[PDB]
Design a protein around this motif. Structure first.
Motif, PDB file in Angstrom:
ATOM      1  N   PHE A 139       0.739 -11.795  38.144  1.00 60.18           N
ATOM      2  CA  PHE A 139       2.180 -11.951  38.038  1.00 60.18           C
ATOM      3  C   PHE A 139       2.617 -13.235  38.730  1.00 60.18           C
ATOM      4  N   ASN A 140       3.899 -13.561  38.578  1.00 59.48           N
ATOM      5  CA  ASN A 140       4.439 -14.829  39.050  1.00 59.48           C
ATOM      6  C   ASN A 140       4.901 -14.789  40.501  1.00 59.48           C
ATOM      7  N   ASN A 141       4.735 -13.666  41.195  1.00 59.38           N
ATOM      8  CA  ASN A 141       5.013 -13.600  42.622  1.00 59.38           C
ATOM      9  C   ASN A 141       3.751 -13.544  43.469  1.00 59.38           C
ATOM     10  N   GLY A 142       2.575 -13.613  42.854  1.00 60.56           N
ATOM     11  CA  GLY A 142       1.326 -13.550  43.579  1.00 60.56           C
ATOM     12  C   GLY A 142       0.675 -12.189  43.646  1.00 60.56           C
ATOM     13  N   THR A 143       1.147 -11.220  42.870  1.00 60.25           N
ATOM     14  CA  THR A 143       0.620  -9.864  42.893  1.00 60.25           C
ATOM     15  C   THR A 143      -0.346  -9.654  41.735  1.00 60.25           C
ATOM     16  N   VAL A 144      -1.461  -8.983  42.017  1.00 60.73           N
ATOM     17  CA  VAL A 144      -2.473  -8.659  41.019  1.00 60.73           C
ATOM     18  C   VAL A 144      -2.628  -7.146  40.975  1.00 60.73           C
ATOM     19  N   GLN A 145      -2.640  -6.587  39.769  1.00 55.18           N
ATOM     20  CA  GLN A 145      -2.849  -5.163  39.559  1.00 55.18           C
ATOM     21  C   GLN A 145      -4.131  -4.941  38.772  1.00 55.18           C
ATOM     22  N   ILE A 146      -4.923  -3.965  39.206  1.00 49.84           N
ATOM     23  CA  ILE A 146      -6.161  -3.585  38.537  1.00 49.84           C
ATOM     24  C   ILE A 146      -6.035  -2.134  38.097  1.00 49.84           C
ATOM     25  N   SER A 147      -6.333  -1.872  36.827  1.00 49.38           N
ATOM     26  CA  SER A 147      -6.187  -0.547  36.246  1.00 49.38           C
ATOM     27  C   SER A 147      -7.431  -0.190  35.445  1.00 49.38           C
ATOM     28  N   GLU A 148      -7.586   1.105  35.180  1.00 48.05           N
ATOM     29  CA  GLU A 148      -8.762   1.625  34.498  1.00 48.05           C
ATOM     30  C   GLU A 148      -8.566   1.599  32.988  1.00 48.05           C
ATOM     31  N   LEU A 149      -9.614   1.188  32.272  1.00 51.17           N
ATOM     32  CA  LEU A 149      -9.508   1.034  30.824  1.00 51.17           C
ATOM     33  C   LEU A 149      -9.450   2.382  30.115  1.00 51.17           C
ATOM     34  N   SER A 150     -10.310   3.323  30.505  1.00 53.37           N
ATOM     35  CA  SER A 150     -10.397   4.598  29.805  1.00 53.37           C
ATOM     36  C   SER A 150      -9.238   5.533  30.118  1.00 53.37           C
ATOM     37  N   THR A 151      -8.496   5.280  31.198  1.00 50.78           N
ATOM     38  CA  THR A 151      -7.435   6.171  31.638  1.00 50.78           C
ATOM     39  C   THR A 151      -6.056   5.524  31.647  1.00 50.78           C
ATOM     40  N   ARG A 195      -4.683   4.111  34.126  1.00 52.96           N
ATOM     41  CA  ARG A 195      -4.110   4.413  35.425  1.00 52.96           C
ATOM     42  C   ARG A 195      -4.462   3.313  36.411  1.00 52.96           C
ATOM     43  N   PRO A 196      -3.490   2.771  37.143  1.00 50.62           N
ATOM     44  CA  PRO A 196      -3.794   1.685  38.082  1.00 50.62           C
ATOM     45  C   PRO A 196      -4.708   2.148  39.207  1.00 50.62           C
ATOM     46  N   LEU A 197      -5.533   1.219  39.691  1.00 51.60           N
ATOM     47  CA  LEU A 197      -6.481   1.492  40.764  1.00 51.60           C
ATOM     48  C   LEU A 197      -6.109   0.771  42.053  1.00 51.60           C
ATOM     49  N   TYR A 198      -5.992  -0.552  42.014  1.00 50.74           N
ATOM     50  CA  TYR A 198      -5.720  -1.351  43.196  1.00 50.74           C
ATOM     51  C   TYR A 198      -4.525  -2.251  42.936  1.00 50.74           C
ATOM     52  N   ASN A 199      -3.947  -2.749  44.025  1.00 47.87           N
ATOM     53  CA  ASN A 199      -2.759  -3.590  43.939  1.00 47.87           C
ATOM     54  C   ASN A 199      -2.724  -4.416  45.223  1.00 47.87           C
ATOM     55  N   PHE A 200      -3.217  -5.649  45.155  1.00 49.35           N
ATOM     56  CA  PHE A 200      -3.282  -6.510  46.326  1.00 49.35           C
ATOM     57  C   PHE A 200      -2.490  -7.786  46.094  1.00 49.35           C
ATOM     58  N   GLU A 201      -1.800  -8.227  47.140  1.00 51.42           N
ATOM     59  CA  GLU A 201      -0.959  -9.413  47.105  1.00 51.42           C
ATOM     60  C   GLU A 201      -1.653 -10.539  47.856  1.00 51.42           C
ATOM     61  N   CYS A 233      -5.173 -22.691  45.465  1.00 57.63           N
ATOM     62  CA  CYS A 233      -6.008 -21.825  46.284  1.00 57.63           C
ATOM     63  C   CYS A 233      -6.800 -20.865  45.407  1.00 57.63           C
ATOM     64  N   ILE A 234      -7.995 -20.503  45.875  1.00 55.80           N
ATOM     65  CA  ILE A 234      -8.847 -19.516  45.217  1.00 55.80           C
ATOM     66  C   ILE A 234      -9.272 -18.478  46.245  1.00 55.80           C
ATOM     67  N   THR A 235      -9.128 -17.201  45.895  1.00 52.46           N
ATOM     68  CA  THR A 235      -9.508 -16.093  46.759  1.00 52.46           C
ATOM     69  C   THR A 235     -10.421 -15.140  46.001  1.00 52.46           C
ATOM     70  N   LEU A 236     -11.460 -14.656  46.677  1.00 54.17           N
ATOM     71  CA  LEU A 236     -12.439 -13.749  46.092  1.00 54.17           C
ATOM     72  C   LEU A 236     -12.212 -12.335  46.609  1.00 54.17           C
ATOM     73  N   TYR A 237     -12.217 -11.367  45.697  1.00 55.02           N
ATOM     74  CA  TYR A 237     -12.054  -9.962  46.032  1.00 55.02           C
ATOM     75  C   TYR A 237     -13.223  -9.168  45.469  1.00 55.02           C
ATOM     76  N   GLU A 238     -13.419  -7.975  46.018  1.00 53.02           N
ATOM     77  CA  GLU A 238     -14.506  -7.085  45.632  1.00 53.02           C
ATOM     78  C   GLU A 238     -13.901  -5.887  44.910  1.00 53.02           C
ATOM     79  N   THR A 239     -14.284  -5.697  43.645  1.00 54.15           N
ATOM     80  CA  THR A 239     -13.543  -4.808  42.757  1.00 54.15           C
ATOM     81  C   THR A 239     -13.943  -3.343  42.870  1.00 54.15           C
ATOM     82  N   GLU A 240     -15.063  -3.029  43.518  1.00 53.08           N
ATOM     83  CA  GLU A 240     -15.481  -1.634  43.601  1.00 53.08           C
ATOM     84  C   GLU A 240     -14.656  -0.846  44.610  1.00 53.08           C
ATOM     85  N   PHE A 241     -14.227  -1.485  45.699  1.00 52.37           N
ATOM     86  CA  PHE A 241     -13.400  -0.841  46.706  1.00 52.37           C
ATOM     87  C   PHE A 241     -12.101  -1.578  46.993  1.00 52.37           C
ATOM     88  N   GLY A 242     -11.937  -2.800  46.497  1.00 55.43           N
ATOM     89  CA  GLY A 242     -10.685  -3.517  46.634  1.00 55.43           C
ATOM     90  C   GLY A 242     -10.447  -4.107  48.007  1.00 55.43           C
TER      91      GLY A 242
END
Lengths: 464, 358, 138, 85
Positions: B181-193, B195-201, B236-245
């Motif tokens: 999004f344009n405020n710096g927020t990223v949302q991660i959701s599940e494909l089969s469901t 339903r959102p999983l993580y939400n980190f700014e 800027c570039i930031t790395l995140y880990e998607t299994e636990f967020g």
């Protein structure tokens, strides 16, 4: 006969006649692994598996050798498949437990603090299955359990996911020191009103004490008991664990006095009672193992404990000349300079220590954040200065990483609130301030408590 | 992953800015603001001008800024693109000329939405994801057969966590969707469901509103996520880990920042060990994922063009294009064009190809 | 601990074959390499000293170990890299210099002697699996 | 003019913040690691050379030997360190 460098030529000669001999391939790979040729052993075991895909010992050896180069996913997959195929051999089960433990330890080292706890729980589950169903027992499995039980104490934000039921099952399925620390399974969980950290420490002590089979194994057993009691004493700060650690260290030194880590532990144990004995132990430890730099840091910190600044400075100068890549000497120098009165040099040394630490020290993060906050409160700065904003952002990140390991720290929470209110990060400030307000409310009847509560409430009103 | 050699080049490829590029095994496709869609054949010969093996098609008078291609084995090759007005347009590529067939896959009620971003998810049914100017993500399943009879089936939507502009989207092979999004927020959701999983700014500070996600990418293993965002005139570039967020770290270089001006696009190589970023400052930088350290840097000039008549030194206003910013970058798998390859598009209306030594 | 100054049945499983016939000195070098010993070769250029190096590379590849080729001239590393990559199939070739690294996890690595000396003084883990080291232009 | 010169805000600037804001030696040490002095030894029986069983024995090799304190080829490997340089 366990002379594996002499069999390499014979195995190669045998393979030159019949290249399809699987047993010769397994033997040659085993010889390479024993000689320190891990990658060649991996290649040889892969060839052996290619020749015969149904060979289970080749797969076990390949997984064990893959664990030695930091490839835990492939090794865990191979070992899980092998253990699902032949589930009645204890060797494969112990190998799987070892690989899981090593993977979790590496993940903790590299900063993946959330995956390490889950892998630790999985390791505990496998250990429980082994001990209960397979009815097996040896020293290695208890060593692994003790090693993996420490991640619940180091990562204190996840101590509430401790598998107490599996642990009591494992300990129930399976006397000289029991009178000093009073750790017994029959009366372990009886005492109420204690956190989960105490339970984890007691389980670590019990796991060390249960690992029973020229008197080297007995000395190692007592040394491990002493180290576990020392860790429990450091975390909980109670006198009865120091005496148990001293007892175990003295017994191990009686059984074998040639080892340096025992003298290191004995020096750390008595570091508060008698400084002369601690200095003697540290000096003997240096004499036995002179390529160890932790003894010098321990001795310098002991000198700083009794307020001898010049002695500590000399020891730290030697340590910096010996281990520059370490971050502890820089932290010690920065502490000495901060006590002396210098400000610029102290800040430079704190920054260098924090950068060298690479997220592995809580003290470095805390000191760096405190220094950055102390330099930019009444300094007359404007939001347009990029460097100040970047410093504040780095301090906030460091404090978050610190809170992942040691939450419920009042000073760190206050510093975090001060930084967040200034970076306009109000939701994180709200969460941290709720935590801090709960802590201070639980902790309280005095006067300074009321004043600190009033200041915290004023900042909390500012956040709203 | 340390030496890159220029292979082929093409200057003044389009009549306006080349905003995006994508590639498959057969060809490379690019879009531009003039409204045309161009196809560049990947299987070239020695000393063959890429403009000789190129095929163009007119799409929309408004212009195009997003494109993606799907190739799977009956051989189907699909292209989906988004125009500046907000339309979603699908074309089928058939071969030895190239034939463009317009496909009408969206119903009447689905043609009233303004789309910005899009991405194809290949089978490992194929899936399509897209973002809306209102901050919504749509999920589709593509069925080629009932005989050729393509249909697009709507699976569901994901609403915005807060509404803000949805600027980027990605889908992993393990079944995850990431939206920026344009405020710096990223949302991660599940494909089969759905339903959102993580939400980190990921904001350095909230003093000013100049934070915005420009690109989100999933690792080829799917266990890592890279984010490119603005920091008030920096990249800027930031790395995140998607299994636990959880946050892993950031990529930075002396110029706490990865690029000097802005980071436009990201890309992983086949093994997921190297990451490349494109900057508005006119540079490509390559990073080591495990050590989080810079490896190499490439510089873009208007004089890199092989043919001297296609060199665009200045634009229509007289401003210099001596060091032009890069719009997009893409890694190409081995055998598409021995070793891996790379492609990028710049402000001088040029498209460039590179080769990895080894 | 000594130095000594010096076919189808002696070596019935050769690690490499050539269309032509090897000379006597090439056969002696191959035979003593197969027996498990070190060799020093001194001959005129273009007499065929690269056959010994190629046989050593192939023999180390058969045992699933590694080989290191070193020279004191930095302008020959690239030529040797290209030549070896053209000559060998199914064997990987790598190149290590001050800045660039090409195929770090290969079977035969090419560098200069200064790079190898720095590696030895810094305890590089690459030397764990190395069986042969070739010194050229001594 | 009203928005640029006479609009108050609920976010306090750094000047007001400056006006109102007010800012164990044993935990620095490292406890040594545990020591394990046992391993499996796999035994063979028969002319083909197939493994028949294993026993736990004592190994004659310091215990925690890494690249910082040992020169042996059998010391542990640090895979987070550069393997080429």
């Amino acid at each position: 006969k366990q002379e594996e460098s002499d069999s390499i030529e014979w195995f190669q000669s045998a393979l030159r006649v019949d290249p399809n001999d699987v047993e010769s391939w397994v033997g040659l790979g085993q010889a390479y692994h024993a000689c320190g040729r891990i990658e060649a052993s991996i290649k040889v075991f892969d060839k052996a598996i290619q020749l015969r895909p149904s060979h289970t010992f080749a797969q076990y050896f390949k997984a064990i050798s893959l664990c030695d180069v930091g490839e835990y996913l492939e090794s865990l997959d191979i070992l899980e498949k092998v253990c699902q195929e032949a589930a009645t051999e204890e060797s494969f089960q112990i190998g799987l437990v070892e690989v899981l433990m090593r993977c979790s330890l590496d993940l903790y080292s590299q900063g993946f603090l959330l995956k390490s706890v889950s892998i630790a729980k999985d390791t505990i589950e496998r250990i429980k299955i082994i001990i209960s169903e397979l009815k097996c027992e040896n020293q290695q499995v208890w060593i692994y359990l003790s090693q993996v039980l420490r991640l619940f104490i180091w990562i204190e934000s996840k101590v509430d996911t401790l598998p107490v039921e599996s642990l009591v099952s494992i300990f129930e399925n399976s006397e000289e020191i029991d009178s000093v620390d009073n750790i017994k399974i029959d009366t372990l969980l009886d005492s109420t009103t204690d956190d989960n950290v105490s339970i984890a420490c007691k389980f670590l002590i019990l796991a060390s004490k249960y690992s029973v089979s020229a008197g080297t194994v007995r000395a190692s057993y007592w040394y491990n008991i002493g180290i576990s009691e020392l860790t429990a004493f450091i975390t909980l700060k109670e006198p009865q664990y120091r005496d148990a650690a001293i007892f175990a260290f003295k017994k191990s030194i009686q059984l074998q006095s040639n080892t340096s880590e025992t003298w290191i532990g004995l020096g750390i144990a008595t570091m508060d009672i008698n400084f002369r004995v601690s200095q003697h132990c540290f000096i003997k430890a240096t004499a036995l193992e002179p390529k160890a730099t932790n003894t010098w840091f321990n001795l310098a910190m002991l000198g700083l404990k009794k307020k001898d600044t010049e002695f500590a400075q000399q020891v730290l100068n030697k340590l910096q000349s010996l281990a520059p890549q370490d971050s502890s000497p820089w932290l010690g120098m920065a502490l000495i300079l901060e006590e002396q009165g210098d400000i610029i040099g102290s800040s430079k040394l704190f920054a260098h220590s924090f950068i060298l630490s690479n997220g592995r020290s809580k003290a470095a993060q805390f000191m760096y954040a405190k220094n950055v906050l102390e330099n930019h409160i009444n300094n007359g700065d404007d939001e347009r200065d990029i460097e100040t904003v970047e410093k504040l952002t780095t301090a906030s990140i460091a404090l978050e990483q610190f809170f992942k390991k040691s939450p419920d720290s009042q000073f760190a929470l206050q510093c975090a609130l001060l930084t967040l209110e200034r970076l306009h990060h109000y939701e994180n400030a709200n969460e941290l301030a709720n935590r801090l307000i709960g802590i201070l409310e639980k902790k309280f009847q005095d006067e300074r408590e009321l004043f600190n509560f009033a200041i915290i409430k004023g900042q909390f009103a500012r956040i709203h | 992953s340390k030496v890159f050699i220029a292979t082929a080049n093409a200057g003044k490829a389009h009549d306006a800015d080349i905003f995006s590029v994508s590639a498959c095994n057969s060809f490379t496709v690019s879009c531009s603001g003039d409204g045309y869609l161009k196809v560049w054949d990947n299987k070239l010969l020695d000393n063959e001008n890429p403009k000789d093996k190129s095929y163009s098609h007119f799409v929309h008078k408004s212009g195009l800024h997003h494109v993606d291609v799907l190739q799977a084995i009956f051989e189907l090759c699909l292209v989906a693109t988004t125009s500046f007005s907000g339309d979603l347009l699908f074309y089928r590529i058939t071969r030895k000329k190239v034939i463009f067939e317009k496909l009408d896959l969206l119903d009447s009620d689905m043609k009233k939405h303004s789309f910005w971003a899009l991405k194809w998810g290949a089978s490992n049914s194929h899936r399509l994801v897209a973002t809306d100017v209102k901050g919504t993500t749509y999920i589709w399943k593509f069925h080629p057969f009932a005989n050729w009879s393509p249909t697009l089936e709507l699976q569901g939507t994901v609403e915005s966590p807060m509404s803000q502009f949805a600027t980027s989207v990605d889908i992993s092979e393990r079944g995850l969707i990431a939206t920026g999004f344009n405020n710096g927020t990223v949302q991660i959701s599940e494909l089969s469901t759905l339903r959102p999983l993580y939400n980190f700014e990921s904001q350095h500070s909230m003093i000013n509103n100049s934070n915005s996600i420009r690109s989100v990418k999933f690792s080829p293993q799917g266990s890592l996520l890279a984010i490119a965002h603005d920091s008030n005139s920096f990249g800027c570039i930031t790395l995140y880990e998607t299994e636990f967020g959880e946050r892993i770290g950031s990529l930075s270089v002396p110029t706490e920042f990865a690029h000097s001006s802005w980071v436009m696009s990201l890309s992983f190589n086949d093994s997921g060990e190297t990451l490349c970023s494109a900057g508005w400052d006119g540079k490509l930088r390559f990073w080591d994922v495990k050590t989080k350290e810079r490896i190499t840097t490439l510089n873009m000039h208007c004089d890199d063009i092989e043919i001297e008549e296609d060199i665009l030194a200045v634009d229509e206003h007289g401003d210099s294009l001596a060091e032009p910013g890069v719009f997009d970058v893409k890694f190409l798998k081995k055998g598409w064009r021995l070793n891996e390859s790379l492609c990028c598009v710049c402000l001088d209306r040029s498209i460039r190809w590179f080769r990895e030594a080894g | 601990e000594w130095a000594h100054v010096v076919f189808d049945e002696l070596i019935p499983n050769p690690a490499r074959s050539w269309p032509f016939e090897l000379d006597t000195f090439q056969k002696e070098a191959v035979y003593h390499l197969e027996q498990g010993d070190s060799v020093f070769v001194a001959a005129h250029t273009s007499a065929g000293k690269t056959v010994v190096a190629e046989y050593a590379i192939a023999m180390a590849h058969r045992n699933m170990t590694k080989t290191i080729y070193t020279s004191p001239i930095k302008a020959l590393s690239n030529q040797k890299f290209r030549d070896f990559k053209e000559t060998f199939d199914d064997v990987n070739i790598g190149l290590i210099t001050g800045d660039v690294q090409i195929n770090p996890d290969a079977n035969c690595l090419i560098m200069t002697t200064e790079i190898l000396r720095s590696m030895l003084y810094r305890g590089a883990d690459l030397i764990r699996d190395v069986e042969f080291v070739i010194f050229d232009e001594v | 003019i009203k928005d640029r010169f006479l609009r108050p805000s609920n976010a306090l600037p750094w000047s007001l913040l400056d006006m109102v804001q007010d800012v164990d030696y044993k935990e620095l040490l490292k406890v040594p690691d545990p020591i394990n002095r046992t391993s499996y030894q796999f035994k063979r029986t028969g002319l083909e050379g197939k493994i028949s069983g294993y026993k736990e024995e004592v190994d004659l090799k310091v215990a925690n030997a890494n690249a910082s304190n040992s020169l042996s080829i059998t010391r542990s490997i640090n895979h987070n360190q550069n393997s080429v340089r």
